[PDB]
A and B are shown apart, each in its own frame.
Chain A
Amino acid sequence: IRIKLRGFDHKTLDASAQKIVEAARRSGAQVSGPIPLPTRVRRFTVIRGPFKHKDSREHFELRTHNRLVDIINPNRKTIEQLMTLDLPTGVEIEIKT
């Protein structure tokens, strides 16, 4: 019954989890509210200049944010209109059983 939400942008992650939470709750029935999973973090630490200068760096980060929702009382009025919901570009979705 699960929809799993992952993206590089967090403000778009609650966009997609705002609507998807609403979609199942409308077309019946129970939704396990959008759960904020812990973020997996990838740091990039790099010497600023092109040549030597080791003691000056610039810090770069990549947040793969994490969300999970459960559609509890499933009820196939839901399972259709989901295959027609508007995904913002920067997120991927996982649905399994």
Chain B
Amino acid sequence: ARKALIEKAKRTPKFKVRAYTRCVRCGRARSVYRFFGLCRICLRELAHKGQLPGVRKASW
């Protein structure tokens, strides 16, 4: 159970509750940020690449 799932998440559901976020990049269901469409992993990868506008490593 993967592609059928990265798929069932794209489609509009028989009830509103069944709405769930997947990673727009890797398909990962858990730890998915609303703001990026990304999981915690992918978020890290692009950010390191610079493919995340304004997004930089924080140090305080």
Chain A residues packing against B (C-beta within 8 Å): 7-9, 42-44, 46-48, 50, 58-64, 90
Contact = CB atoms under 8 A, between A and B. Distances in A.
B56 to A, nearest CB: 6
Interface string B21-43: 00000000000010100001101
A61 B43 contact: no
Given A7-B54, A59-B59, 16 more contacts: A8-B55, A43-B58, A44-B43, A44-B55, A46-B43, A47-B40, A48-B44, A58-B44, A59-B58, A60-B56, A61-B55, A61-B56, A61-B58, A62-B55, A62-B56, A63-B54
Contacts, number: 41
Contact of A60 (B41, B47, B53): B47
